[PDB]
Amino acid sequence: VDLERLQALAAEWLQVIGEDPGREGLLKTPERVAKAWAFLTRGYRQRLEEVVGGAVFPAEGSEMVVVKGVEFYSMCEHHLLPFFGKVHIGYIPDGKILGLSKFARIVDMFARRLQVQERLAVQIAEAIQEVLEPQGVGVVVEGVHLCMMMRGVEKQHSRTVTSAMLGVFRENQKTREEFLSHLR
Amino acid sequence: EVDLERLQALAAEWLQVIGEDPGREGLLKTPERVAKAWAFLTRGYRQRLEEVVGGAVFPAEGSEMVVVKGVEFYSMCEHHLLPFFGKVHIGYIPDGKILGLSKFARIVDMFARRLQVQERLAVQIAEAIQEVLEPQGVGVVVEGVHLCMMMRGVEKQHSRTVTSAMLGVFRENQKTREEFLSHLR
Amino acid sequence: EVDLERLQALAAEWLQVIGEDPGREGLLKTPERVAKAWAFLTRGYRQRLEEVVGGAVFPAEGSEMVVVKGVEFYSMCEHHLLPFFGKVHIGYIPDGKILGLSKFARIVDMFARRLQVQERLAVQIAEAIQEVLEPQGVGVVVEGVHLCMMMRGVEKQHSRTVTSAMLGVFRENQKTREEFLSHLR
Amino acid sequence: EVDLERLQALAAEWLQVIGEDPGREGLLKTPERVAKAWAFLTRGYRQRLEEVVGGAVFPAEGSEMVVVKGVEFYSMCEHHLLPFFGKVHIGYIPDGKILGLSKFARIVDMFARRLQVQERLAVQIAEAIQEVLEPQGVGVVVEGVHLCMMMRGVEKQHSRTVTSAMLGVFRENQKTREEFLSHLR
Amino acid sequence: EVDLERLQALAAEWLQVIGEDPGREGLLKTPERVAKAWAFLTRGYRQRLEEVVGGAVFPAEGSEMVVVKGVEFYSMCEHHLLPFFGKVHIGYIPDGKILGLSKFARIVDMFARRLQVQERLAVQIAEAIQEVLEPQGVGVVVEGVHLCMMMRGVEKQHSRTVTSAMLGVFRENQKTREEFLSHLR
Amino acid sequence: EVDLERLQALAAEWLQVIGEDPGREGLLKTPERVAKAWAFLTRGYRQRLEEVVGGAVFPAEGSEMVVVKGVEFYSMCEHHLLPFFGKVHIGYIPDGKILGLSKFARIVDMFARRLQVQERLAVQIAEAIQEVLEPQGVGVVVEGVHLCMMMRGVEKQHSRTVTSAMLGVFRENQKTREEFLSHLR
Amino acid sequence: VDLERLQALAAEWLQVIGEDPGREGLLKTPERVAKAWAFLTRGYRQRLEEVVGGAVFPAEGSEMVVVKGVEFYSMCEHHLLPFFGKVHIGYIPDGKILGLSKFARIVDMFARRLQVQERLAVQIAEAIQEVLEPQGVGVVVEGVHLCMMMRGVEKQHSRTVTSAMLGVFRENQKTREEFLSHLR
Amino acid sequence: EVDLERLQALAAEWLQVIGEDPGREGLLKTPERVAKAWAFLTRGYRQRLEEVVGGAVFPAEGSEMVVVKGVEFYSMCEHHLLPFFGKVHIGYIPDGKILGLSKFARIVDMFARRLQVQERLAVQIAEAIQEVLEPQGVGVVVEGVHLCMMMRGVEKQHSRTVTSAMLGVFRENQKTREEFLSHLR
């Protein structure tokens, strides 16, 4: 009975900040917020095996596959404010390739949680490593943080880059550079 | 002001309900940070237009339109409590009085740091300026992206919304409104 | 609602007729995926306008035009069953009521996920908004690229098509229409 | 080759199952147009590399790398039968033989106009080039957007995928590969 | 119907007169290739508007303007027999009937694949569309670069030429023409 | 020395064979204009490298690389007699002597105004410069679009071709070539 | 003896804010500041007649002349912090045209003063009106203000547009629009 | 025409007065190169409009506006003898006569290659066009940067100047002028 509990909490939140839950513009707000939050945290209850499904196929070649620009939206665990941007995924197969759409589904699984950008990148990389067991995986996350833009320091031109490199992407300098070069 | 203690408690419980552990290192100080954050995000309700403007009202130097554009803003939609942000463009034709440019930004923040709907935000900003300067006319255009539309639900990514408010000559004089809008292009 | 089992069979036969092997490892689950895909791409016929709006209709805050631009859309041309896509720009002047921004996107998807001609898409979105809000007027601009025109036939690569529908003041008032169009530039 | 009548009937029934009316003025000739479209979209299965090249092979002028970039392509994903498209970048170092520039586009189309996965498309284009000419090396980079990801399922909008294949010196000589890749930036 | 053999002969003599070896390895098949080329580049003379449009003329979904922009074209200037190319933008207001998007591209190619003058090209495309749809009005804009101006003679590099033709309401309604032209910006 | 009269004759017969009226108002002076045109477009064959460079060869001010980029060029492909054009980038490390910037453009035009193959063009320009300055090394990159590929046959639109030639240190010193190529990005 | 007086004031300013006028990086600072300020206020002591010189010529035609993008730098009189941008000048002659370089010299005359952007535009327009007595003059000033960016509100994306229209630019709607259109 | 020897000696002495050494290896042929350069830069004084046009006048194809934009030009300011350059935009409505596109560039150069002031340059180009053809109207817009402002005196860097001339309908018909000006944006 979590949605109802969230609704009540949201209703009281509105009052504590000085608003009126009874005015027209806020009537269904506690309910809308509850559903929004169940969706924004749905990643905690997802299972990788189910997320990937039967979309793993035999590798067609040996070269690096790069899936760039997968937009994501997450919530920083420190202030509970959104941070969003793009996730760039690169990998070298070892007999298995993933359906392109599954990369976005994996990204969403870890993004729709309370996060820190440094963690988001490692978890995405590790999930891909588990599913495909590739020669190597590279993940670059680049996002803008509202907890830095609409509050506190209030900087406007800043964006953060975090990444995770596994297998040959970590141990082969040229391989890493080639992946990072594809992103420029 | 805002009962930070109650906000903290509510936030601590919110963490438990969504499935998290309020005890872990990364969330220990979260309720506190969130309470402070929301007090700041709603400080606009507790502001006074006269205090916000201060002593930054000066004599007009001319009768031509003054356009202050690209004033970035950040707000919270009253429908989903998710941020919506962008820029506010202000235009006005003086009547003996002009405002310190930085005060436009302060007025924008006063009405943005509340729970809002973009349509209202433009109107209140325009009305606040009309009250302070009693100009011949005021024009306000708000352009913003909404996370409640990108981060969830419909999940559209390329959309932006434009709202505005036109007072005095900006409403009645087509050429004046058009000139203001052309300046934004 | 749609006979997925029959779509699967049709797709399986389709693969065989074009010269492919339905037994390939890369096509085993294709008829199933195709069936699901097409049920989604045609879900627009099974939707109801009032359920899509869901009561997210609120009182107008001002009299000024609201412009929701860049709403991405994806559709299928009824002529070749090949995708055509781009953006939908919506503008309207309220008469008592405004719509929750995301509902415009939901209205767009409702008519886009059907077999269409871009000319009809612009009309139906505009009419739907007209029915839901009974505004002083509504304007809709659809801009899209057509694959039936680039990956087949003439094979042109730089072309884009603009269609539009104007109701009420967006049709009757030349100045309101131009202002809406200017906002899109 | 392909049974257009079989495809016609399959498409006609496809319209009915998804909930449409084949009798509609706009859908009258659709089953026919679809059959011919799909015959065109799969024509690459029936093409011969020897005829595609048409003996447009000439003696090499030098030993330096030739880069043919931005060859747009259109294909269909074998998993969902939805289009994916973009550009194909080709680079090679001759060994007494160079190919007519336009034949590279003809080779790209030969393999694109089939059911595919982007990883395979790049390999077959490179292998085809290595077969036609006897280059010291070949490099092929494919970059495309996939509608199966954009208009359905995950519905991501900013994503693009890069796949490639390196043969000969492009695989052995690190500097050569980097030089090719740098030319594409 | 064009005499390919006669063209090969003329082309072979052309190569000699300019001081080149027709027996050279990379020129042996040139007269043949040039012959086929020019037959394609002038095929527009041998086309019928009735066949080009086919049966893709459907009922209008609305009365609003339809704008098909960025239709790339390639032609040959009759004065120097050197290529000139760019894009063709078409706008029209239907009267009960609309055309299939792609057919616009075919009409453009029909008049472009001839020896031309840009001023004439814009007129012939507009008249063709007027004859086919008999709409309330048609607007056509052609914008291109001319090699006879940049590759020879004056050798200017940044120049582009705009020519157009306006029929029906696009000529009679000033607002209509402006709205069409604004869509192109 | 080219027989202009013979070209006019051949051009006049060319106009007839394709199904056009040579007596037409806008074609009467065409054979004459085409004759003069082709004499100019092939004048490169009738030029001497010694005269082209003139006496503009001066002592080197330093030992660092000189990069002359963006030298636009226009040529004619020997296979189809259709224009191909773009830019030529030249890089070199002098050995006591440097060339006047503009002379680089003249050398480019000398080899471009002929019937060519892009691979050959890059080689001949590089060899010409090597012969004139006898520097430590020379690097030449040619990038262009080919009308025979976009205006005819495959009709691809986004494609561009890069060909090059490396002499001396630009071939022997990997760092030197990379540095030259990086300047072009 | 103003430069010396400014030097002394600047030296004390350094101390009051917590700095040390004796450290190497500040040694010649009081002197540098004094000269900078004499230059930044030189506009007060300039004479229009001298600024224009003999660069007024007979008009060649009747159409509008538009000199756009004349960069300027000024000091806001409210906080003594810089505001800068561009000045766009448009005018229709009545027998006399000005040397293009003189427009920039006129702009500098009024910019190098303590200003408010609204005033800067009118003074530039009025100066041009006096020198040429044209059928009309139009001046558009667009600048960014540091007193708004590096202090106070601290907004980053904002820029202000001010203008002045005299003669036919004020009274002829089409003429004004044509001028403003040239700036887009 | 021009006395190259007189110019040579003047330039040779100019070098001495500014403090240079005419005996320097780099200045040896300078006085000569300068004389020929200045003869070229002033050649427009000695050109005849009738010969520049070379009878390249053809019967009008339509009544719609022809716009030739981006014709780059280079000139010298009569006040400082420093270069100013940019582009020339030409627009006109025919009256039975149209001009060869390349002749517009030839006319621009005729008046640019003189000592000038930008205001006059536009007027003379328009007057020249009105003389050659008998258009219903002519519009000419010149946009250039002036080195006399950039490398000396005020030393402004972002400035550009626009001058124009309107004759016939471009001066009488407001809409026609606006349409021409809009085409340039």
Place this chain on the structure above:
Amino acid sequence: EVDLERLQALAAEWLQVIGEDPGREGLLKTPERVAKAWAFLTRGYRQRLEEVVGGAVFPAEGSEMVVVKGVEFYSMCEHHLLPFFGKVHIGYIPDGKILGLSKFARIVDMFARRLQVQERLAVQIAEAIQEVLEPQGVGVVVEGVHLCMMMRGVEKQHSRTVTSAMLGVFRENQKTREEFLSHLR
């Protein structure tokens, strides 16, 4: 703290000395505003790194480089007391500890809100981060425009200055420094 009264007095006199009237309406409150402004512009001297960081130090989630870029800054040159501003790019490889992203901005401000020289600014920011996190390495790049170079003296307009500081692995490991710098491109 800062003696605002003395600053006010000094400012009031400064106004008199430059030639202004401290009595006029626009300057009456100037000394006061300027005093406050400078107290703020120098608040960095009075800050403590430990208080600035607060409790925003958390356990590292990985061993990969974290790059925080585009942090806008505003400072005052100690040479002319004129503003210099731009962006600061920070990169570091953790050793068990990572910082709250917003604290980087706070550290940047702490050292920017003082009289500075850009070379020093980069070093102090880097050192402050090294002290707080004791990372394996730190990289800081500062890019800024200087008004003392644009607003006066040399008056250059297109110049920007790049300074940096590299500590730990960012200084000793070439590949690590290079990777950080590539991320800024």
Place this chain on the structure above:
Amino acid sequence: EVDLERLQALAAEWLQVIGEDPGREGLLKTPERVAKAWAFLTRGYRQRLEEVVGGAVFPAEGSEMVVVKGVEFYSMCEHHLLPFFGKVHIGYIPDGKILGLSKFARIVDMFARRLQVQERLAVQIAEAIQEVLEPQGVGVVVEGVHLCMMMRGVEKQHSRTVTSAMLGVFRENQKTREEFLSHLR
């Protein structure tokens, strides 16, 4: 320092020889303006490096490279006396001392306001900085457009020339040089 009276006379005679009237109202004061202009454009010969630097040499704050980019420059080619311009990018690694940023611009102007060849300009600026600071190394990159190449002779429009000079570590250390160059991209 320069005989302005003699330059005036030479210029007056120049005007007369090219075919102009020295009596025109637009040329009356031209010889005088030209003389002043040329004294300014050659003032670089009369400047002294130590006076240009003016003791604005300070102690190094760090060991990292300082890169001052985009310093605009204007110069005159000694070959044709026509302007060439663009930008100068400076990079250096200190050894005890750094230079006031604006002095780099003053050093640039000192060598630019002379008759030059771009190759020498890069060398002299680098050597000057080397002498003033005795750094571990200095790198200079000059990028410019040459009017003698665009408004005369070959008349190419897209070309730009890059010259450079590398001293100390910028010459001896491949990695430092690449890092400097990378910063310029």
